[PDB]
Amino acid sequence: DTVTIRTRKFMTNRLLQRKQMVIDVLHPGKATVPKTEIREKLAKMYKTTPDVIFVFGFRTHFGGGKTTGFGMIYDSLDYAKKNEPKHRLARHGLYEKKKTSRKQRKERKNRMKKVRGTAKANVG
Amino acid sequence: ARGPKKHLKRVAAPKHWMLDKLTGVFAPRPSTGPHKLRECLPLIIFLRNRLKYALTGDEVKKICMQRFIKIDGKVRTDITYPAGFMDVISIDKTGENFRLIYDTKGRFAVHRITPEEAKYKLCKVRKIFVGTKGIPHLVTHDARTIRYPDPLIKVNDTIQIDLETGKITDFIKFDTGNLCMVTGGANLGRIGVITNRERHPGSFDVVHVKDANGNSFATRLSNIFVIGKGNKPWISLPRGKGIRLTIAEERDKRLAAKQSSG
Amino acid sequence: PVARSWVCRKTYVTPRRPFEKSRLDQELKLIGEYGLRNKREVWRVKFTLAKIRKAARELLTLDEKDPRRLFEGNALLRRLVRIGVLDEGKMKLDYILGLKIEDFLERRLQTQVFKLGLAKSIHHARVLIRQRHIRVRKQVVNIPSFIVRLDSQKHIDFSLRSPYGGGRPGRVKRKNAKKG
RNA sequence: GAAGACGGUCGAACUUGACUAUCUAGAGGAAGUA
RNA sequence: CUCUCGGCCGAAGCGUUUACUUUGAAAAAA
RNA sequence: UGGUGACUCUAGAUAACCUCGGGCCGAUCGCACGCCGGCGGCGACGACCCAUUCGAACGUCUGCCCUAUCAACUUUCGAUGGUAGUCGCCGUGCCUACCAUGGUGACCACGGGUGACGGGGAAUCAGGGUUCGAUUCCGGAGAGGGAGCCUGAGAAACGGCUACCACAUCCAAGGAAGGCAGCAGGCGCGCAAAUUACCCACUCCCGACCCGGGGAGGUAGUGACGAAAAAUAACAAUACAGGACUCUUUCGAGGCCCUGUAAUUGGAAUGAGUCCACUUUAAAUCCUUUAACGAGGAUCCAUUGGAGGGCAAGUCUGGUGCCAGCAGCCGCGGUAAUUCCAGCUCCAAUAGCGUAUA
RNA sequence: UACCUGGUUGAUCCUGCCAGUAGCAUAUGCUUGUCUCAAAGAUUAAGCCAUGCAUGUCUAAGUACGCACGGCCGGUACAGUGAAACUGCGAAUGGCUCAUUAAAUCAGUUAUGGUUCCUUUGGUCGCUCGUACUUGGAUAACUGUGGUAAUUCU
């Protein structure tokens, strides 16, 4: 109960359909507050659900009192699925990147330049 | 090179974009368009570095691709589209309209204008020719050509465009006593009244401008944009009135803003 | 092409005469009065005053009503008054040439902790700062060469998360309490 | 409408000279070096 | 330092020609 | 008609021409659906020409290091100029034909050298200067050496082609393929320089493109090139045939203040570490934040050079005996070495400090 | 911080160099606890290079008769998503290096009234007096037969 959330540079972004702001976190004795706890704290400030809000990039200051990150609060969940980087959607389980590496894709791309039409799909 | 270059390093970008050193190696590199790339704002810099509506270039791509930005009444999906001096940037979704006008320190200001004002702009006529069965033509400073202008419009005048039709409504002539903005050089962004013009043949002419407080400065003729007739500007002017303060009185104003506020 | 910056700068200058008696004695006296770590900490403060005096030596050659002398002569005086090295009434440009090393060494946070009664020597104060016992208004400072400004001077305290301040007792008191 | 051929041009390179330079195999010796 | 016009002043000439000096504008960022 | 400081400019008028290796004058595609069989609203892709933007290319003026043991050069085979052409994107000896005999030079031409890419800049600096700039920005050049081209708006392109020269690969001996001065990596060369790592999340670029790709770029790794901050202890109580301070003639008395070469006593404070968790990030690491553990010879051990002078600091002690060696220089060493080799002590800079070279 | 010091003589004052002194860059030696930033196969060899990667690209909108998958509802030109291939664009930017090069490159300044310019942006696109309610032949992908020790060969 000793943690507090403040909001400095607030702006309603009508273009990307979100509210965006700087979050100040005051945890004067504890470690850095986790990102899910800040979303529970922020959703009851801004009268919403925590699955539509996306916080990132928190840095605790030297000495240990304050933390500063950024947050965004979307209108709907589908607007959040449309207007978000996929690495932040993946932090909530709403997106899954394919698990191939990058050296496999490049060597597979170069192996099938040596091959004409429908045998390109039969390249291993 | 063996052909035209497509990149712009961030250190070699124009100074008035106010990019910083460490966020990348490259600068946005404006597309070819109506304004020169040493004299323009790309739309990505206006929309995340000035307005703070975006945080990445990907979000500028997402904002522009929803067809939400009109520059001079037309929708631009190009994120490096060169906006320039006295272009009307109109965002319909937020209900904002902007005009790009230089500040007193030679950078484009975030100047908000009313949607009454957002239906016109001023242009500077740079070339007149007669072409192909005697039809007279203009060429303005943002690459507009206009067929059949008024025959009193001459080179270095300033006309007024209606942004929907594209036609001239009226114009100002180039004469002493009219109001200026400097659009180039050391004196960029300053505003005053023409007092003199000395003509050197075969070279550049020099125009002397007098500030509203009695300061006086010269430019070249190409760095002169006639704003208004007499003393009345035909547009709204930014925060400073085109009056460049010295560093001492700017320090005094900045200190007087702290001993009163707080 | 990398997106870095290679601007850096040295903070000290070694003297031209490496073994000069009456320089060694004076610098060792300056170390002992203020509890510095080595001679480079002395030469660092000789370097800032030598730049300040070079900046004021050139303003004193310009015209008395010149705009650079009036503008940078007033910013240079404001900073010295602000960090407490000049006096308020001494704000002419010629008193910069009458500044000394000890006037800057007084404004280190280590000497201010010693002189405000938080410590009991100049060596207890450095070791108090370095292990996170001193703060300045909200912010714990680790740095002994923190130049205290004149308005942020009375806000020096004992850093609420320290045993000398708010006081969860330390690692040693806790173990001795657990033992018996 | 492909191969090809006469000619022209650009022209790397090739051969034989002359001059010049270097790398290497090389008898003989001299002086100084100690 | 002056001559015709355009509004007692400007447009038309400079005054032998330079060097000098002061100014202005033009001079990428780092 | 209009313009420029200036046109052989722009526009106009007339007579024609208009290249089969043809010039423009739309046989193209989506969405919404329609109003009175017709007339349609938004787009997309096109397109000769004009203007604009990004350029590019040719010119103008001034500016560069050393060399005279380089003083005359250029002109046959264009050197300097004139006339007409050819070719070129165009101006021009750019090339050709015919003429003229010019053009440069001790105010350094021409020739040679450069451990020479040019600038912005860097180090040093009283003032003046001297040296460096291969190197992240701009400009040039080149992809083993020369040469020739195709495609295209743009290339004499080399992660395009065709030869020759030098190397070099596969071969069934008929033939076929090549270009790391991109990122890694290897060999070599040397006094001299890092990972065959992760990612397009950031910055931007390209494409038909909100979607794909990017060894550009970002992120880690190695990293004492170099720059910034900054631990290796602090305090109290004892004891000193310490020291100074108040009294005592002096002895000698004090919570008066400082010091110590006390492995004297004492608990207080911490990071280095070990290490949950969060935070960071594309995912991670690092840092920052917090649990728990983590100090007494706090063995959780600071080094590099010196100790005659220059130049801070021992003619203390043993060994050596013109030897071994030291010493930038002057010098030390031959049986008492302030100088070698060691111990002890002391000096300087300190997570840095010697040596070599510019 | 506008600075000197040792060394020629029996002793002196000079000329004069040698040596000392401080920085800065490359190397190298010994030593190295914390943390922030950070150069890095230039110098010799613009020497030689195994292997991997560094340049590709589709929207409602050029061309879909691949059941590749589904899918109308089943006369229903073409529902759709769509590999391949044709077409278009890009591959002339970026990255690397410093060999050549001495009025050359380059810098400042000027000029193109002596040129070309994909693209972007604006203009122009019934201005011409002389089968169209739509023209013609092919060729890939695909199917099938093959050659060569061998290729992104055909």
Ordered DSSP codes for B155-175? TT-EEEEETTT--EEEEE---
Pair B79, B64: CB distance under 8 Å: yes
- Count other C-beta atoms under 10 Å from residue B187's C-beta: 20
Terminal Cα-to-Cα distance of chain C (whole angstroms): 64
Start-end of H helices in chain C: 24-34, 40-59, 67-82, 101-105, 109-115, 122-130, 171-179
Kind plus residue range of the DSSP H or E element containing B195: strand B191-198
Amino acid identity of residue C166, one-letter, is G
Q: Which residues contact C35 (CB under 8 A, 6 or more apart)?
A: C110, C121, C122, C123, C125, C126
Q: Which domain holds residue C96?
A: 18-180
Inter-chain touch A64–C135, beta carbons under 8 Å? no
Q: Does A29 touch chain C (CB under 8 A)?
A: yes
A31 vs C contacts (CB less than 8 Å): none
Q: Scan for tokens 């404004």, then name that residue.
A: C107
Quick one: DSSP state of residue C64? T
State this model's resolution in angstroms: 3.0
**Rounded distance, CA C82 to CA C77, Å?**
8
> Looking at the domain assignment, is residue C40 inside a domain?
yes
DSSP reduced 3-state for B153: coil
Distance of CA B248 to the CA centre of its chain: 28
Kind plus residue range of the DSSP H or E element containing B128: strand B120-131
Inter-chain touch A65–C138, beta carbons under 8 Å? yes
Tokens representing A75 are 């209108």
> Looking at the domain assignment, is residue C179 inside a domain?
yes
B 39-68 near A (Cβ less than 8 A): 52-54, 56, 58-59, 62-63, 66, 68
Start-end of H helices in chain A: 35-45, 77-82, 86-89, 103-111
Q: Which residues contact A39 (CB under 8 A, 6 or more apart)?
A: A50, A53, A55
Pair A89, A75: CB distance under 8 Å: no
**Rounded distance, CA B25 to CA B41, Å?**
19
Count of structural domains, chain C: 1
**Rounded distance, CA A28 to CA A23, Å?**
16
Kind plus residue range of the DSSP H or E element containing B59: helix B57-64
Maximum Cα–Cα distance for chain B, whole Å? 69
Q: Which residues contact B232 (CB under 8 A, 6 or more apart)?
A: B179
**Rounded distance, CA B206 to CA B223, Å?**
10
Pair A49, A74: CB distance under 8 Å: no
- Count other C-beta atoms under 10 Å from residue C48's C-beta: 14
**Rounded distance, CA C21 to CA C26, Å?**
9
Residue B188 has phi, psi (to 5 degrees) of: -65, 135
> Looking at the domain assignment, is residue C1 inside a domain?
no
Number of continuous H segments (helices) and E segments (strands) in chain B: 3, 17
> Looking at the domain assignment, is residue C9 inside a domain?
no
What are the beta bridge partners of residue B138? Answer: B128, B146
Q: For residue B192, which of B203, B173, B202, B178 has the smallest C-alpha distance?
A: B178
Experimentally, the structure was elucidated by cryo-EM
C-alpha distances (whole Å) from C146 to each of B69, C8, C109, C134, C135 are: 50, 20, 5, 12, 11
CA distance A78 to chain C (A): 36
Tokens representing B176 are 């002493």
Distance of CA B172 to the CA centre of its chain: 17
Interatomic distance B51 CA / F214 C1' (Å): 30
Sign, Cα dihedral of C91, C95, C97, C101:
negative
CA angle, B236 as apex, B233 and B238 as ends, to 5°? 115
DSSP reduced 3-state for B47: helix
Interatomic distance A8 CA / F68 C1' (Å): 79
Q: For residue B6, which of B44, B24, B32, B25 has the smallest C-alpha distance?
A: B32
> Looking at the domain assignment, is residue C156 inside a domain?
yes
Maximum Cα–Cα distance for chain C, whole Å? 76
Quick one: DSSP state of residue B83? E
Pair B104, B240: CB distance under 8 Å: yes
> Looking at the domain assignment, is residue C92 inside a domain?
yes
Q: For residue B84, which of B108, B66, B49 has the smallest C-alpha distance?
A: B108
Pair B50, B44: CB distance under 8 Å: no
